Nucleic acid binder design. Structure first.
Length: 131
DNA sequence: TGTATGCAAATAAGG
DNA sequence: ACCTTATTTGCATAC
């Protein structure tokens, strides 16, 4: 429930730093503990209660565990120019075909997947511009 | 050097 | 497969 997490977040911040652990370590420690590591950003945000109640309830355990006991694909950096060609392409055809997508990943040196996702995100951005 | 944060990739859930 | 939709999560960078 509410306060329960309110506190856990706090005591966790104390114990963590006292034990000589940066959010950076804490994140990556869970890496060699569960598979998916957590960037410093997520750790910081969890401490500052800067996350959704659900995400907060989801993360408490994982962390809480780590605390006492101790006592995902890499983000593709879409470059400015590729982002442009992508935008150009989108302006011509919003919902590209699988093969078309493949064709683009081919001409733009990047993984096919990063493109399908971009086209889905773009269609989402588009909705926020024209409901 | 550690920590905060804005933008946007990537994801989970359900067709 | 692969979509929409809502949300989770990390890069990059300025305190």
């Amino acid at each position: 429930d509410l306060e329960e997490l309110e506190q856990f977040a706090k005591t966790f911040k104390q114990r963590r730093i006292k034990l000589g652990f940066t959010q950076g370590d804490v994140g990556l420690a869970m890496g060699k503990l569960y598979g998916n590591d957590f960037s410093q950003t997520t750790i910081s945000r969890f401490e500052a209660l800067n996350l959704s109640f659900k995400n907060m309830c989801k993360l408490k355990p994982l962390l809480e565990k780590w605390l006492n006991d101790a006592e995902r694909k890499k983000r593709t950096s879409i470059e400015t120019n590729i982002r442009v060609a992508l935008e150009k392409s989108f302006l011509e055809n919003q919902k590209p075909t699988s093969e078309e997508i493949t064709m683009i990943a081919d001409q733009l040196n990047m993984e096919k997947e990063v493109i399908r996702v971009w086209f889905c995100n773009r269609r989402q951005k588009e909705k926020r511009i024209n409901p």
